[PDB]
């Protein structure tokens, strides 16, 4: 029985897609299927913010941020809970979850 | 420095075993600075907390 109409991978009207190695595994996955996640955070985290802010030789020095694109092979995600399974109907919704309050 | 603090609201209870209360802090110096803080034992709104480290912020247990 066909589960998804799009077959899990985003490939449409082209034959084959350049494969990429997973972040976590190293398992090989085509770039279309790969569960992708972008990460923008600050180099230093929550508390050490306030701490380091004092130790500067600069006034109003704004911390640099760290930018990383992750790919997660289908397995690795579900283990990391970046992605979890949902109901037959609620499957169909491709609208990204509400991290915006 | 030693500081004082005021309870504006009670939000939730942080803890593994449900120990800490996660509460919201005004400063009694009439400043408008608002910091979330972890407190142990019973807390109702309006109470005053004494902070030995006053620049610290709240993390989720």
């Amino acid at each position: 029985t066909k589960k998804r109409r799009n077959n899990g991978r985003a490939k449409k009207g082209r034959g084959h897609v350049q494969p990429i190695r997973c972040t976590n595994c190293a398992r090989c996955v085509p770039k279309d299927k790969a569960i992708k996640k972008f990460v923008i955070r600050n180099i230093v985290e929550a508390a050490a913010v306030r701490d380091i802010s004092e130790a500067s030789v600069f006034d109003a020095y704004v911390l640099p941020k760290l930018y990383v694109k992750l790919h997660y092979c289908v397995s690795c995600v579900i283990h990391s809970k970046v992605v979890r399974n949902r109901s037959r109907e609620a499957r169909k919704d491709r609208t990204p979850p509400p991290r915006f309050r | 420095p030693i500081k004082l603090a005021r309870v504006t609201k009670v939000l939730g209870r942080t803890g593994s075993q449900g120990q800490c209360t996660q509460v919201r802090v005004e400063f009694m110096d009439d400043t408008s600075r608002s910091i979330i803080r972890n407190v142990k034992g019973p807390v109702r709104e309006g109470d005053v907390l004494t902070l030995l480290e006053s620049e610290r912020e709240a993390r989720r247990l």
């Binding site: 398992r27 090989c28 180099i43 701490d51 380091i52 130790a55 020095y61 911390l63 | -």
Partner: protein
């Protein structure tokens, strides 16, 4: 025991903080980088292989090299943070963050923060094998 400078002006070293998931280095050099002042590593401060990486190691290592440089007249540290890079992880290990916070506390001065992980334009094949590393 070092550079001769007034009380206002701060002497700058360049600190490389390398956090893999195996262990951290806190490595302090000149501006050029061609001379190392002091280098302490995670597996050095703590004895067990498990603990090699863990933040606690970062702590110790950092406190120590920072001390040793506070000796030699280096107050301020430019920081170049590093994740293992290349084909493997681009996240810095957990150690780095801690380490950084640590050699703040020792009373060091912090210059610019910069992120250098070697990043490929396009790499050699990664060390697992097609079906991945499974466990």
């Amino acid at each position: 025991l070092g550079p001769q400078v007034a009380e206002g002006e701060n002497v700058f070293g360049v600190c490389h903080i390398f956090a893999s998931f195996n262990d951290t280095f806190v490595h302090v050099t000149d501006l050029s980088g061609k001379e190392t002042i002091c280098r302490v590593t995670g597996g050095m401060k703590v004895k067990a292989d498990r603990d090699e990486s863990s933040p606690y190691a970062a702590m110790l290592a950092a406190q120590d090299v920072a001390q040793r440089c506070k000796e030699l007249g280096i107050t301020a540290l430019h920081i170049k943070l590093r994740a293992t890079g290349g084909n493997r992880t681009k996240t810095p290990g957990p150690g780095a963050q801690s380490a950084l916070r640590a050699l703040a506390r020792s009373g060091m001065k912090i210059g610019r923060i910069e992120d250098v992980t070697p990043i490929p334009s396009d790499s050699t094949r990664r060390k697992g094998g097609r079906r991945g590393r499974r466990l």
